Design a protein around this nucleic acid. Structure first.
Ligand SMILES: [Zn+2]
Ligand SMILES: [Zn+2]
Ligand SMILES: [Zn+2]
Lengths: 372, 503
RNA sequence: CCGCUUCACCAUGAGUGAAGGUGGGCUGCUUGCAUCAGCCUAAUGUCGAGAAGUGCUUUCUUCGGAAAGUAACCCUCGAAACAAAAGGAAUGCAACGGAAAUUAGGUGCGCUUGGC
DNA sequence: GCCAAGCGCACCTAATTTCCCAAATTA
DNA sequence: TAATTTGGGAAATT
C-alpha cells in the first residue's frame, strides 16, 4: 500500500512567534537526531566489542532517544516521529560492513515530525502552551521558548495553507503530510515515423511515446565505417553481428512500446499492416535505412509482447496517414512527402481547423482513430 | 609565506630493492643486451637503418622474464616485489578509509556529546592528536600513516560549521582513498629520503615488517597482513618513480617548471614532507600506482608593480579579456580550441543511455552509467588543460606589461552575468578563476576578486552610466561596438573591472 | 550510408556533385590536441557472480519491529583492446597542484494530484 | 510529452574550504 | 638519530 505525500505552503496561521518556534524545534530535534546516531554508533562499534543486535538498538532508542526528545519537547508526537526517524537511519548491517558512516543532517533540511483536524485550507494540530524562558542561555541563543505538556496545557495551533512534517522550502514553510492509499474502450495507435522510427499515441488522450534512433544511428555509422575500411570473410561476420544487434534492438523497442501502453491502461492498440509500412515512401525506415530492415520481426515482437501484457492488437489500413488531420480530418493535399523534402521536414498544419504539431504524432493520432 | 605548495604526480615503476638486488637486476639486463649483440634505434645505431625503439631488438632484449624473477625470489628471499606491495597498498587504502570514518565519529562524540561542545579551534589540535592519531597508531603502528591521517581528517572536520549544524560529519565512500604519509621537514628534519641512483627518482617510505595473517576473514579478504611497528622492527619500502618521458620533455633543460621542480626534488634542494599514494587506472588485473609528492616552491619574482592595476572580465565575443588601468594594451582569449571542445562534448552526449531505463539495466547504477562516467572523465581533463592554457596566456600578458595587482569579476557576477560567452554559446568558474589566480600567485601578481557596479554599460573613459547598451539592445543590433552619451564592448567591461574604486 | 571533414555550389539544412576519412575506442609508461604503429569494436553493446540495501513472498510477535527466502531494481562487485607489472614501446605542439570533504543546484526515473 | 509541485533515490556538477606542521620526548 | 607523540579549554538567525 503506497504513501501519497501532499506538501502545501503555511503562508498564514500570530506569525513571527510561529517562525521562531519552528526554527527552534528544527534545531533542537536535529541535535537529538545527530547526537543519537553518533552516541549509538559509538556504543555498538567504538565501545561494545564491535557487535550488538537490534535488541540493543531498541533498548537505546526506546530508553535514551525517546526519553530525551520527550522530556525536552513534552509532545509525544514529535518524540515518537523522531524516535522512528533515528531507528530508520541507524541501519545496523549497512554499518557492520564499514561500507560507510552515519547520515548526519544539517539543522535546516531536517523536517520537524508531528501527528489531523482540517477545514476548507486550515490545518489544526495539538501543541503544548509555550511560555518563554526568563533565563536565556548565553551559548544557546536560538532556543527562546520552553514547551509544556499537551495534556496539562494544550494550546493547539492552526495553519491556513495554500504522519505530518514541517520544513523550509527548496524562506517560507512547507507542510508535508503522507496519507495511506491503496480498459478495452480506450484505443491506441502505433505509426512508423520519419524522424522517430515508431511513434505511439492514444485517441481522445494527449499522451505519447516516440522511439529515438540515437542507439540505431550511432551503431549504423560505426558499421558503415568498419565496412569502408574493410573494402581496402570478415564483412560476412559483421553482417551476422549486425543482425544480432538489430534483433535485440527491436525487442527493446517492443518492451518500451508495451510499457507505454500498459501505463495508460490502453487495452486495444492498432497499427497499419505489413505492406502499408513496408512501402510508405515517407517512413524513417525507407528514407534513412534504404528500405532494408526486418519489418515482419518488428511487428511480431511488438504484437507478442503487447499480447503478453493482455493488450489486443488490431491491424488497420493507412487512409492518407501523413496528409489527413487528426483533430478534424481535412486532407492538406499540399502536405506531399515532396513538399516536406524541399523544406527541413516541418510540423503539420490543418488550415481548416488550424492544428500545427509533429507530423509523426499527427500520423499516430490518425491511426489510433477507431473507424480505420 | 614567501613560498607556494604544489604537487608532483609521479607514476611508481616498481618497488626498488637493496644495492645488491638492483645491481644483479641491472647486470642481467646488460647481460641480455650483450648476448643479443639488421635495423636499430638511435642508441643502438651509435652501437643499419633507424627504426622506432618499440621495433628495436637491442631495446626489446633487456625486458626480463619470470625465469629470472624466480631465480631472484630464490637468491634474495627478503627483497620486495610488486605483488606483496600492491596487496599492502590495497589493504592500506581500505584501512585508511575505515579509520577516517570511525575517527570523524569518535571525534564528533568526544567534542560535542562527551565534551558538551566546550571546544575552540586549538582544543581541536588536542582532540585530533588524542582521538584520531591514537586510533591510526593502534592500527598502522607507523607514525607516518598515523600523522598523515591526522592531517587528512583535520582538513575535513570543521568545528564551527559542525557545532551550528551548517553541515554533516564527513564520510568517505571511495574504492580508491589515498594513503597519506607525513615525514617532518625543515630544521634538523629532511622529509622523505629521496635518492637518485644513476639518475632515477627513488623515494623511501618508512615501514615495518609484514607477516601474512594466519586466520584471514572470509567476508573481507583484503586484510591480508599484520604490520610490526617501524621503531621496533623496520622494513622500509623504496619506490622507483618514472622520470624518463620527462627527461625528454625539453623542459628538462630549463630553470622554471615541473621538470625543474622534479630535478630539484631529486637533487635534494626541495624537500617533501607529504606524499599521498593512490591507484591510477587498471592495466591488467593490476593497477597504476601514482605517488603525489607535495613540495613548496619559492615565488619567481620577475619585476611586477602593484602601482599598475589590471583587469579580467568575461566577454561575449571572447570568453575572457584583459586590461590595464591606463596603458591601452589588452589581451583576448581566442575561442578556437573552445569550439573544437564544444563539437566534442556534443558527441559525448549519451542522453538515451542516461534516460531510457531499458538500456544497460539490472547490474546496478555503477554499470548503468559506465559509458557516461568514462566520457566525463575524458572531458573534464580537456577543460582542465584548456583553462590552464588560458591562465598561462593571461599570466604571460600581465607579466610582459609588469602588473602586480589584477582585479577580476566576482564569481556570482560571471556565473549569473547573463551576457557571458559561457551563457550565450555553451562551465566551472571556481576552477577557471582558481587556475588563473594560482598562476598569477606563482610570479607575484595579487588577485582581488572585485564588485561590478554596472560594468558592461559604464563609460571606461568619462564615467557616464548608460541603460541603452543593455543586453537586449546590444543583442538586437547583435553585439555591436560601444559608444557613450557624455563623451569595443568586452575591452570596456574588463577596463571597468580594472577600476581601483571598486570593493 | 555521413545528424563526418573539406572544395564548392544551392535553398539554418537528416540539401546536390567531387575527393578523402572510424564517423567509436584501447596501450605507447603525468595530461590535452594532432599524428604514427599495433589492437578491440554488436560496446549508446552483451553478460557473469553476488546479497549490503529499496522492494516482494512467507512467518513471528513482547505489534516498534524481528526471522527467513527470493533476485525486479540508477541493487552490489566485475568483464574488449599494443609488443614479448620490473621502464619493450613513439613524433609534433601545448600545458602540468593535488587530495579529501562539505554545501548547493540540477539531471535522470517512478508515483500522488491537474491541464494543454 | 511537457509543465508544475513534491517526494524518494542516486548521480553529477559547481563552488568553497582546508591541508600539505612544528616541537619535544623516547627508544 | 629517527620515529613517535603531543599540542587546550563555549557566544544564532531574521
Ligand atoms: Zn483539421
Ligand atoms: Zn634500441
Ligand atoms: Zn564617456
Amino acid at each position: 500500500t503506497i504513501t501519497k505525500t501532499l506538501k502545501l505552503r503555511i503562508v498564514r496561521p500570530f506569525w513571527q512567534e510561529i517562525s521562531e518556534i519552528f526554527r527552534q524545534l528544527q534545531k533542537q530535534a536535529a541535535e537529538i537526531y545527530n547526537q543519537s546516531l553518533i552516541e549509538l554508533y559509538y556504543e555498538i562499534f567504538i565501545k561494545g566489542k564491535g557487535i550488538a543486535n537490534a535488541s540493543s538498538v531498541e533498548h537505546y532508542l526506546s530508553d535514551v532517544c525517546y526519553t530525551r526528545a520527550a522530556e525536552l519537547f513534552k509532545n509525544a508526537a514529535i518524540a515518537s516521529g523522531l524516535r522512528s526517524k533515528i531507528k530508520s537511519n541507524f541501519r545496523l548491517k549497512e554499518l557492520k560492513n564499514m561500507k560507510s558512516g552515519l547520515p548526519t543532517t544539517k539543522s535546516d533540511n531536517f523536517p520537524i515530525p508531528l501527528v489531523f483536524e482540517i477545514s476548507n485550507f486550515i490545518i489544526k494540530i495539538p501543541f503544548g502552551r509555550w511560555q518563554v524562558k526568563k533565563e536565556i542561555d548565553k551559548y544557546r541563543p536560538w532556543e527562546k521558548f520552553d514547551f509544556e505538556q499537551v495534556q496539562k496545557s494544550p494550546k493547539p495551533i492552526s495553519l491556513l495553507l495554500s504522519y505530518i512534517e514541517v520544513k523550509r522550502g527548496s524562506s517560507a514553510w512547507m507542510l508535508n503530510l503522507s496519507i495511506d492509499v491503496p480498459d478495452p474502450s480506450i484505443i491506441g495507435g502505433i505509426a512508423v515515423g520519419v524522424k522517430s522510427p515508431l511513434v505511439c499515441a492514444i485517441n481522445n488522450a494527449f499522451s505519447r511515446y516516440s522511439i529515438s534512433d540515437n542507439d540505431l544511428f550511432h551503431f549504423n555509422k560505426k558499421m558503415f565505417a568498419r565496412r569502408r575500411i574493410l573494402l581496402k570473410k570478415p564483412i560476412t561476420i559483421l553482417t551476422e553481428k549486425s543482425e544480432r544487434f538489430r534483433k535485440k534492438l527491436i525487442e527493446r523497442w517492443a518492451c518500451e512500446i508495451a510499457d507505454f501502453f500498459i501505463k495508460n491502461k490502453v487495452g486495444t492498440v492498432q497499427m497499419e499492416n505489413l505492406e502499408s509500412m513496408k512501402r510508405k515512401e515517407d517512413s524513417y525506415f525507407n528514407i534513412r535505412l534504404r528500405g532494408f530492415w526486418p519489418y515482419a520481426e518488428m511487428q511480431n515482437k511488438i504484437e507478442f509482447k503487447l499480447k503478453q501484457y493482455g493488450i489486443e492488437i488490431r491491424k488497420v489500413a493507412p487512409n492518407n496517414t501523413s496528409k489527413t488531420c487528426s483533430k478534424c480530418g481535412h486532407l492538406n493535399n499540399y502536405f506531399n512527402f515532396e513538399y516536406r523534402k524541399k523544406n527541413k521536414f516541418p510540423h503539420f498544419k490543418c488550415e481548416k481547423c488550424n492544428f500545427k504539431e509533429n507530423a509523426d504524432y499527427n500520423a499516430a493520432l490518425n491511426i489510433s482513430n477507431p473507424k480505420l | 609565506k614567501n613560498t607556494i605548495t604544489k604537487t608532483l604526480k609521479l607514476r611508481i615503476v616498481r618497488p626498488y630493492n637493496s644495492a645488491e638486488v638492483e645491481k644483479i637486476v641491472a647486470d642481467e639486463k646488460n647481460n641480455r643486451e650483450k648476448i643479443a649483440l639488421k635495423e636499430a634505434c638511435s642508441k643502438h645505431l651509435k652501437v643499419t637503418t633507424q627504426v622506432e625503439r618499440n621495433a628495436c631488438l637491442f631495446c626489446k632484449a633487456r625486458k626480463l622474464d619470470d625465469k629470472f624473477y624466480q631465480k631472484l625470489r630464490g637468491q634474495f628471499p627478503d627483497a620486495v616485489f610488486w605483488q606483496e606491495i600492491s596487496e599492502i597498498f590495497r589493504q592500506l587504502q581500505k584501512q585508511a578509509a575505515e579509520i577516517y570514518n570511525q575517527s570523524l565519529i569518535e571525534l564528533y562524540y568526544e567534542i560535542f556529546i562527551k565534551g558538551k561542545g566546550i571546544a575552540n579551534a586549538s582544543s581541536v589540535e588536542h582532540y585530533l592528536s588524542d582521538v584520531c592519531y591514537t586510533r591510526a597508531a593502534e592500527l598502522f603502528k607507523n607514525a607516518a600513516i598515523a600523522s598523515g591521517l591526522r592531517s587528512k581528517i583535520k582538513s575535513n572536520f570543521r568545528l564551527k560549521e559542525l557545532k551550528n549544524m551548517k553541515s554533516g560529519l564527513p564520510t568517505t565512500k571511495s574504492d580508491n582513498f589515498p594513503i597519506p604519509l607525513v615525514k617532518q621537514k625543515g630544521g634538523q628534519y629532511t622529509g622523505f629520503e629521496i635518492s637518485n641512483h644513476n639518475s632515477d627518482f627513488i623515494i623511501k617510505i618508512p615501514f615495518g615488517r609484514w607477516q601474512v595473517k594466519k586466520e584471514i576473514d572470509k567476508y573481507r579478504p583484503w586484510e591480508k597482513f599484520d604490520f610490526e611497528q617501524v621503531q621496533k622492527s623496520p622494513k622500509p619500502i623504496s619506490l622507483l618513480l618514472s622520470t624518463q618521458r620527462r627527461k625528454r620533455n625539453k623542459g628538462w633543460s630549463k630553470d622554471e617548471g615541473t621538470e625543474a621542480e622534479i630535478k630539484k626534488v631529486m637533487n635534494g634542494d626541495y624537500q617533501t614532507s607529504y606524499i599521498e599514494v593512490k591507484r591510477g587506472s587498471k592495466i591488467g588485473e593490476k593497477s597504476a600506482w601514482m605517488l603525489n609528492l607535495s613540495i613548496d616552491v619559492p615565488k619567481i619574482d620577475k619585476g611586477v608593480d602593484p602601482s599598475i592595476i589590471g583587469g579580467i572580465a568575461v566577454g561575449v565575443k571572447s570568453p575572457l579579456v584583459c586590461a590595464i588601468n591606463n596603458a591601452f594594451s589588452r589581451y583576448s582569449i581566442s575561442d578556437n580550441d573552445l569550439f573544437h571542445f564544444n563539437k566534442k562534448m556534443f558527441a559525448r552526449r549519451r542522453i538515451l543511455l542516461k534516460k531510457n531505463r531499458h538500456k544497460r539495466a539490472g547490474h546496478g547504477a555503477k554499470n548503468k552509467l559506465k559509458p557516461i562516467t568514462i566520457l566525463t572523465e575524458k572531458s573534464e581533463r580537456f577543460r582542465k588543460k584548456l583553462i590552464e592554457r588560458w591562465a598561462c596566456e593571461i599570466a604571460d600578458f600581465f607579466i610582459k606589461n609588469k602588473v602586480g595587482t589584477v582585479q577580476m569579476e566576482n564569481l556570482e557576477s560571471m556565473k549569473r552575468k547573463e551576457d557571458s560567452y559561457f551563457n550565450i554559446r555553451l562551465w566551472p568558474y571556481a576552477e577557471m578563476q582558481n587556475k588563473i589566480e594560482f598562476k598569477l600567485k606563482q610570479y607575484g601578481i595579487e588577485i582581488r576578486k572585485v564588485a561590478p557596479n554596472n560594468t558592461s554599460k559604464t563609460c571606461s573613459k568619462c564615467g557616464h552610466l548608460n541603460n541603452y547598451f543593455n543586453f537586449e539592445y546590444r543583442k538586437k543590433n547583435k553585439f555591436p561596438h560601444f559608444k557613450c552619451e557624455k563623451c569595443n564592448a568586452d575591452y570596456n567591461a574588463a577596463l571597468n573591472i580594472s577600476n581601483p574604486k571598486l570593493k
